[PDB]
Amino acid sequence: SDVGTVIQVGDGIARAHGLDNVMSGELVEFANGVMGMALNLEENNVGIVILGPYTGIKEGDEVRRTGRIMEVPVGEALIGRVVNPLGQPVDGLGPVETTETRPIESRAPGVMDRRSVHEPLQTGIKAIDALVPIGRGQRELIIGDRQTGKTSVAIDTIINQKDQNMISIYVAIGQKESTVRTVVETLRKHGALDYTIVVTASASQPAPLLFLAPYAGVAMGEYFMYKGKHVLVVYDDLSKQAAAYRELSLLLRRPPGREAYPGDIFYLHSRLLERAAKLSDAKGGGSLTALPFVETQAGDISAYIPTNVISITDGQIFLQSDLFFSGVRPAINAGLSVSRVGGAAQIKAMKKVAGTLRLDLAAYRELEAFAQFGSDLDKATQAKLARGARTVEVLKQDLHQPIPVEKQVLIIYALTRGFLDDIPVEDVRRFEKEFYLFLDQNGQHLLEHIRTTKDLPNEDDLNKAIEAFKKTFVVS
Amino acid sequence: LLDAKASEHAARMTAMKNATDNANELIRTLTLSYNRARQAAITQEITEIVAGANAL
Amino acid sequence: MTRGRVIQVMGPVVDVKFENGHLPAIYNALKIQHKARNENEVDIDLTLEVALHLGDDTVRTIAMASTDGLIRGMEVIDTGAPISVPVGEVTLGRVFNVLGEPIDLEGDIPADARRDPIHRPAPKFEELATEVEILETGIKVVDLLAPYIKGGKIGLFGGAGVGKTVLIQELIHNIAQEHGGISVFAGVGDRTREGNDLYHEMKDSGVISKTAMVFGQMNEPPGARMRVALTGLTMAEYFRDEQGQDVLLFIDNIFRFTQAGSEVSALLGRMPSAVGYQPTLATEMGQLQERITSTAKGSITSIQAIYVPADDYTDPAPATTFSHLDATTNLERKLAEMGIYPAVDPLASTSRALAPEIVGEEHYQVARKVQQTLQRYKELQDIIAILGMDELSDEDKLVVHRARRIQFFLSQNFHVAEQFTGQPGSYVPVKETVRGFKEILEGKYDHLPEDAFRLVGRIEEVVEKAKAMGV
Amino acid sequence: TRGRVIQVMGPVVDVKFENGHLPAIYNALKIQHKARNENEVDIDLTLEVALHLGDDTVRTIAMASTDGLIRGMEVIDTGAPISVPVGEVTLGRVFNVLGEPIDLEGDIPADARRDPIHRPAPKFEELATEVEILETGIKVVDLLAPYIKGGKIGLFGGAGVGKTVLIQELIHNIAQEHGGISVFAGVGDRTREGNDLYHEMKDSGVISKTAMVFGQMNEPPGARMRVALTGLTMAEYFRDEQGQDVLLFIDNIFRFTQAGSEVSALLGRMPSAVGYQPTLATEMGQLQERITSTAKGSITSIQAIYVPADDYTDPAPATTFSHLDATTNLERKLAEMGIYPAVDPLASTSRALAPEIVGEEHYQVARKVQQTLQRYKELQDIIAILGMDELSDEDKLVVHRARRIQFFLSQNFHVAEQFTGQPGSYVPVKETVRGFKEILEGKYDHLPEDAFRLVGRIEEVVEKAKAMGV
Numbered sequence A: 001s002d003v004g005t006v007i008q009v010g011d012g013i014a015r016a017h018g019l020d021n022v023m024s025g026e027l028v029e030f031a032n033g034v035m036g037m038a039l040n041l042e043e044n045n046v047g048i049v050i051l052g053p054y055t056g057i058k059e060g061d062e063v064r065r066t067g068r069i070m071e072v073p074v075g076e077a078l079i080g081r082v083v084n085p086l087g088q089p090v091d092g093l094g095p096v097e098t099t100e101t102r103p104i105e106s107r108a109p110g111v112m113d114r115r116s117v118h119e120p121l122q123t124g125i126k127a128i129d130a131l132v133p134i135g136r137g138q139r140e141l142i143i144g145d146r147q148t149g150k151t152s153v154a155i156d157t158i159i160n161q162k163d164q165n166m167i168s169i170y171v172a173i174g175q176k177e178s179t180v181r182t183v184v185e186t187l188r189k190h191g192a193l194d195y196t197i198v199v200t201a202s203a204s205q206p207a208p209l210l211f212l213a214p215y216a217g218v219a220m221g222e223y224f225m226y227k228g229k230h231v232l233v234v235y236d237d238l239s240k241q242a243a244a245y246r247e248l249s250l251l252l253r254r255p256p257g258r259e260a261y262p263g264d265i266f267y268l269h270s271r272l273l274e275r276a277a278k279l280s281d282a283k284g285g286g287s288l289t290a291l292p293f294v295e296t297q298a299g300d301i302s303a304y305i306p307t308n309v310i311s312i313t314d315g316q317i318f319l320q321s322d323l324f325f326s327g328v329r330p331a332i333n334a335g336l337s338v339s340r341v342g343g344a345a346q347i348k349a350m351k352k353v354a355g356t357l358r359l360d361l362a363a364y365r366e367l368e369a370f371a372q373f374g375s376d377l378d379k380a381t382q383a384k385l386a387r388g389a390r391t392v393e394v395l396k397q398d399l400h401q402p403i404p405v406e407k408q409v410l411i412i413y414a415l416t417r418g419f420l421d422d423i424p425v426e427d428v429r430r431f432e433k434e435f436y437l438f439l440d441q442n443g444q445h446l447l448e449h450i451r452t453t454k455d456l457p458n459e460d461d462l463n464k465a466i467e468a469f470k471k472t473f474v475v476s
Numbered sequence B: 001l002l003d004a005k006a007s008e009h010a011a012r013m014t015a016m017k018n019a020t021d022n023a024n025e026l027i028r029t030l031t032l033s034y035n036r037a038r039q040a041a042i043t044q045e046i047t048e049i050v051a052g053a054n055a056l
Numbered sequence C: 001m002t003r004g005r006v007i008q009v010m011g012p013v014v015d016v017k018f019e020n021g022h023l024p025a026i027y028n029a030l031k032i033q034h035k036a037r038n039e040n041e042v043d044i045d046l047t048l049e050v051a052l053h054l055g056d057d058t059v060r061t062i063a064m065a066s067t068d069g070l071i072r073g074m075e076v077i078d079t080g081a082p083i084s085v086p087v088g089e090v091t092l093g094r095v096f097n098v099l100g101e102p103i104d105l106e107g108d109i110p111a112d113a114r115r116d117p118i119h120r121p122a123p124k125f126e127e128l129a130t131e132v133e134i135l136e137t138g139i140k141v142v143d144l145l146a147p148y149i150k151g152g153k154i155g156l157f158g159g160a161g162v163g164k165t166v167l168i169q170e171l172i173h174n175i176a177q178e179h180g181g182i183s184v185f186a187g188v189g190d191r192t193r194e195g196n197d198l199y200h201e202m203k204d205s206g207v208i209s210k211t212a213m214v215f216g217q218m219n220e221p222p223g224a225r226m227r228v229a230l231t232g233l234t235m236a237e238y239f240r241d242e243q244g245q246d247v248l249l250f251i252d253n254i255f256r257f258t259q260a261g262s263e264v265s266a267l268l269g270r271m272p273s274a275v276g277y278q279p280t281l282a283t284e285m286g287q288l289q290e291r292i293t294s295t296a297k298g299s300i301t302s303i304q305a306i307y308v309p310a311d312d313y314t315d316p317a318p319a320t321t322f323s324h325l326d327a328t329t330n331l332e333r334k335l336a337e338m339g340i341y342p343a344v345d346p347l348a349s350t351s352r353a354l355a356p357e358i359v360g361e362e363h364y365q366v367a368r369k370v371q372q373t374l375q376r377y378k379e380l381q382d383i384i385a386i387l388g389m390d391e392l393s394d395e396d397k398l399v400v401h402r403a404r405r406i407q408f409f410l411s412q413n414f415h416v417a418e419q420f421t422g423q424p425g426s427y428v429p430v431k432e433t434v435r436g437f438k439e440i441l442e443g444k445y446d447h448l449p450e451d452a453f454r455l456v457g458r459i460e461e462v463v464e465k466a467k468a469m470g471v
Numbered sequence D: 001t002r003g004r005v006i007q008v009m010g011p012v013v014d015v016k017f018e019n020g021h022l023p024a025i026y027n028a029l030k031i032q033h034k035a036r037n038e039n040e041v042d043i044d045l046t047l048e049v050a051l052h053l054g055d056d057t058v059r060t061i062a063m064a065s066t067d068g069l070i071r072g073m074e075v076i077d078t079g080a081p082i083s084v085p086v087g088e089v090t091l092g093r094v095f096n097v098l099g100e101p102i103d104l105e106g107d108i109p110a111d112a113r114r115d116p117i118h119r120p121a122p123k124f125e126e127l128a129t130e131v132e133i134l135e136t137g138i139k140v141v142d143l144l145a146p147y148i149k150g151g152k153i154g155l156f157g158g159a160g161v162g163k164t165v166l167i168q169e170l171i172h173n174i175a176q177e178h179g180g181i182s183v184f185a186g187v188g189d190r191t192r193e194g195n196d197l198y199h200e201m202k203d204s205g206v207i208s209k210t211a212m213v214f215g216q217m218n219e220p221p222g223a224r225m226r227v228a229l230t231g232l233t234m235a236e237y238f239r240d241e242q243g244q245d246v247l248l249f250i251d252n253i254f255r256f257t258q259a260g261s262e263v264s265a266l267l268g269r270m271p272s273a274v275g276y277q278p279t280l281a282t283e284m285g286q287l288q289e290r291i292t293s294t295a296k297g298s299i300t301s302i303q304a305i306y307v308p309a310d311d312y313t314d315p316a317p318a319t320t321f322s323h324l325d326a327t328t329n330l331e332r333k334l335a336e337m338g339i340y341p342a343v344d345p346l347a348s349t350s351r352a353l354a355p356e357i358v359g360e361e362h363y364q365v366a367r368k369v370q371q372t373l374q375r376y377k378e379l380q381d382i383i384a385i386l387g388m389d390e391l392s393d394e395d396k397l398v399v400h401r402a403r404r405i406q407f408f409l410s411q412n413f414h415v416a417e418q419f420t421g422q423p424g425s426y427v428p429v430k431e432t433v434r435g436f437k438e439i440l441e442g443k444y445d446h447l448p449e450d451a452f453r454l455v456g457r458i459e460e461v462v463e464k465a466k467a468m469g470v
């Protein structure tokens, strides 16, 4: 039959006897009204994981089979609401009023159902857009140590997506609830919430819901994706998902591994991250795109969980604490940060203006190490040491201040072709702001051409505009 | 010049004596960190092995 | 029969068989009261808390007092509820154990006074309130580099003997006098000597009338130490919600909550993880620390001391608690042995209140410029360890001179240090702390020697301390 | 004679055959169920026998997800191992682990020959070991570790270092000329690179001479292990029966070793070393000892090997080093300096760098470069603490030349057209020897060092300097 009875209850895991027709991955309902998922099926004992408060489930209480595989609610009504991993409203404001459901154990788009990344995702941060570019359908890793700029790069991205017909999801895994309310108030102030969905799994919840939260978040976005509209997803910590499943697998007594992690860490993270794709024109041309985050102890790139995730993604942005405390914010190490799709995900102008800057900012970083040990140097090295210092200052940018792409290409054009060489290093940040003002009042034609064509205007005209501003400037 | 060259050679010699003494002290301090790290790595691997063996 | 029998004993843990169909809930409390019926046997009073339903009508219960003297076949009664702690105005001025009993020898709490449970669900998303204003402690390093926040969580990390408790006593002295509100002091894993010393300090002050104290100390069995933090917080939760008063909660050692759970866990039938810890570390810590929050009804500020097992910040229990805290100061052994009191790491410590709008642009520009000078000198340190400062050139020389000035001018004289060093203490207001750093950063005090910058409060004090030397 | 499921433990399943007619290790089993009621889910599954337990019961590893599996279902015994289409039908197509065509191009007929994936390895009576040199056009490989035609080639590296961007460069150069079949076996790789390669092969026209087996990162572990063996049975048929020479490209053979671990605990095996299977060497040997060039015909085999945690002292790489003929190790420190391809010129080795296998002039120059770069390594410690000006004229001249040699090992590839703008170059071997000899003899030392980065021939370096103004 479809009824069983609980025999062991402890720590969010239970064991039932009976329930003979259950499937792996089913939903099961206890008497209290708390729901559960079956993950193991021995000959006499069904193994069930509890998705709610377990302080009311006693031994010998009944458990009954729903008949459904694990399903997350989807629909247009979820947009602008704060929700649980299960489809349950949290912000107050009443029901979510969804229409249909999707499995959380979907198959990924297969080879021959996907296309190449060819359209940009303009974040509005100079370093990310110029050096480590992001396009629609890419998976991109923000990796770093505590307090380095990870959440801020993710939220600044959502804010600078208002014009495009984008839908964004923010999944908060393991975060203290006060912080999530702070993020939501921040989005509401910048007007971002109108096109976003927030999914919350606070540190007080059973670890199973932490484990289900990322899957629920992609399950919600793929609905839009197969319908054609583009979507972005952010996972606040995948290192806290790894902890949550370590705990669950240790309670279900599966043997340990490297450290105490199971071996099924690679499977867990790949299952999640390979549902991100760019579908082809037959599928209607939608796009998901994904932003995992990963925190590393000692700020170290070489470790188990960091290297596993650095294998599944289509790039990385590694943020360093010594850069951050040394005045470079956003603190991005250009040597360790790479994009595996970089080059196609840029407008034609930015490809021409800024194609090899990332390799160039790595040569400067290495040569600087050598010359701190070289005493006197020659002319070709002093020239390249100058351009490198000027570049690291043009890459600096304060919090909650977006720069449009047309302005990014013009300041990077001055840097690459030598116009910023005369300006002392201290004035490079000031020269940037004055240049944006001058460009808006006078140079509407050059920006018009960039918005119109996605290409660079005639060199003589650009040289004329920039040289004229260099006459107007006043320097220390 | 006689006094200048004589004084330059003596200055390098003590600077070299003190530099060598600082380096040798750092070698004993670093060596102990390596031995403490080596003994911890050999007690972790044996506890993970025995933890899986006790379960199975 | 709702009575049960004991079937097994394993240190802190016990196993109690009950009648079929009548088992306790999973955080429910039990009672053993036994009178010796023969010379061999001994008499007992004990209470226990349910933790797992193990099958065969059995339950596994951790214990709140020592299990020495238990016999299998003893009879166990069921309270029907979680551990219930007396709450209301009657708590003020009193010293308590985990069971709720008064240990102050001033009487016993009237049996009709309302007692509420220890284990209750955490506060909802609709209720929580987020705001920022700055709390002023007069301690230089906190006020510039990592400012504390009203209504937040404040955490003080450090290893054995590195200065956590003296900084807590300085905070009690300044803030609880200025607070105008209720306080709770809760001691999990602390000496039973420091409990008495603090009690006499509070009675002599007259501050006792507005505060309540729970103690469970290093000597107590592992079980009692876990539930003591939860006990202190149910009293504090009544003061924030039903009286509506703002509250301070001070916790003496929160590491001992994780440590105690580790000992009992292996004995409950659980497999290990990481450095021998429990397999439920994140959930157990988070269940306690999510309750300690500001709400629409009122606010709690918690100042917590976190032990680090060795001077190693990679350990599993410290690392998880870093994710829960709004403002954090890390105390380092190296600095303490050099003579820098308090021993705060200027670059590792963080706060959410360091933002132009909250602090003002002058404070923000001064704090960031100080942290940039200190990071350059943490890289120069690798070369000056061997060669000395002959290798350094130009900017390297000027940066090391100013870093030496800054690192000694973050050290202060405390009123609580008077029991150790004969000097008087100093309180430095925030507007004064920022002005001094700027004159050091400009270079206006380049001439004065480094030994005049140690253990002082304001820049005027450095000038008179230099003039005493004449150097 | 049918069977019944008893335990479903994630990836592993257990089946009891009551009659006593049990299957055999490596055999394949079928689960085909149509849903009786609305609650159930339709299932189509293949499973492979791993172990015989006691109570008439067999452990099996699945080749699809065990979602929707219910205790008591029916398992049909094929009586054979997994069988794969082999023949001219394979050419131009993409297949799954079971030989079912993934591509929309069509469906293979049931009249076609199929061969079994498992087979004993070739024997000492009929292996062979002649040496020739395979030209690649990549400066580092062509000088310091020449690939040997008909022999095993290994690219070792940690995450994000340059391994797949090499395989694609070798596929542009070697594929068209080296007439004969090419097989691609993508074990544990992204599905964004599988799609890109299919269109790259369709563009050039290499497809008619190719067959592909793809198993991506998201499959159940069992499918990831048996994807290497599927590619190998196809290449073996072309080597032995047709007799044409053949190329094999296997991407991430570490993902084969890693899968075994995941299934080891649920199979009932005790753990060994750093959480690895108690049978690591034994599985690596069975697979690798089949990939050989016999008296009948030659397989050149080119592999990417993943160094599990940036630790070359790990068991899986250490066990792998014993099987190769030529090896290039990729290092992240070089990739941080921007020297691409990031190949260790000391840790990379080949059996073809022998004075008679490559010539006296080649060998002289190669070992002399390796002395210069080992001398630069020890000298960097002295420079980092004491400073470069402190040292002798011979020490200064070593550092001078070693900087230039290390940057001149970098090269502009055609697959780096997307990553670096510039189009790309092919350097013939004779040219590479001339140029490296000039650097060592000091003729070009007047030029500034930045001119040697990402250039192909030494002629180009002279012009690149002219633009700088020297």
Ligand SMILES: Nc1ncnc2c1ncn2[C@@H]1O[C@H](COP(=O)(O)OP(=O)(O)OP(=O)(O)O)[C@@H](O)[C@H]1O
Pocket (backbone or CB within 6 Å): A145, A146, A147, A148, A149, A150, A151, A152, A153, A329, A330, A397, A398, A399, C354, C355
């Ligand atoms: N571009 C920037 N300029 C200046 N300050 C910045 C910039 N970006 C971030 N910050 C500051 O750096 C810190 C980053 O905090 P944030 O919460 O974003 O980091 P995090 O790594 O997510 O922290 P946690 O590890 O607690 O999650 C804050 O002080 C933030 O205001």
Ligand SMILES: Nc1ncnc2c1ncn2[C@@H]1O[C@H](COP(=O)(O)OP(=O)(O)OP(=O)(O)O)[C@@H](O)[C@H]1O
Pocket (backbone or CB within 6 Å): C158, C159, C160, C161, C162, C163, C164, C165, C166, C167, C341, C342, C414, C417, C420
């Ligand atoms: N501000 C200070 N000025 C001078 N001495 C201090 C100061 N703070 C601490 N000390 C000295 O250092 C020690 C600090 O003792 P304290 O109890 O605060 O350490 P602790 O870290 O709390 O110890 P434990 O880790 O055992 O709980 C004592 O020896 C004390 O005299």
Ligand SMILES: Nc1ncnc2c1ncn2[C@@H]1O[C@H](COP(=O)(O)OP(=O)(O)OP(=O)(O)O)[C@@H](O)[C@H]1O
Pocket (backbone or CB within 6 Å): A310, A311, A338, A339, A340, A341, D157, D158, D159, D160, D161, D162, D163, D164, D165, D166, D306, D340, D341, D413, D416, D419, D420
């Ligand atoms: N030859 C090259 N020229 C220029 N850039 C390169 C070159 N090789 C690699 N890169 C850069 O480094 C990245 C490395 O990507 P690659 O595919 O080689 O990683 P990988 O070693 O295959 O990773 P995995 O081990 O997961 O397969 C490229 O996407 C590009 O940014």
Ligand SMILES: [Mg+2]
Pocket (backbone or CB within 6 Å): A150, A151
């Ligand atoms: Mg964050």
Ligand SMILES: [Mg+2]
Pocket (backbone or CB within 6 Å): C164, C165
């Ligand atoms: Mg103390």
Ligand SMILES: [Mg+2]
Pocket (backbone or CB within 6 Å): D163, D164, D189
């Ligand atoms: Mg690859």
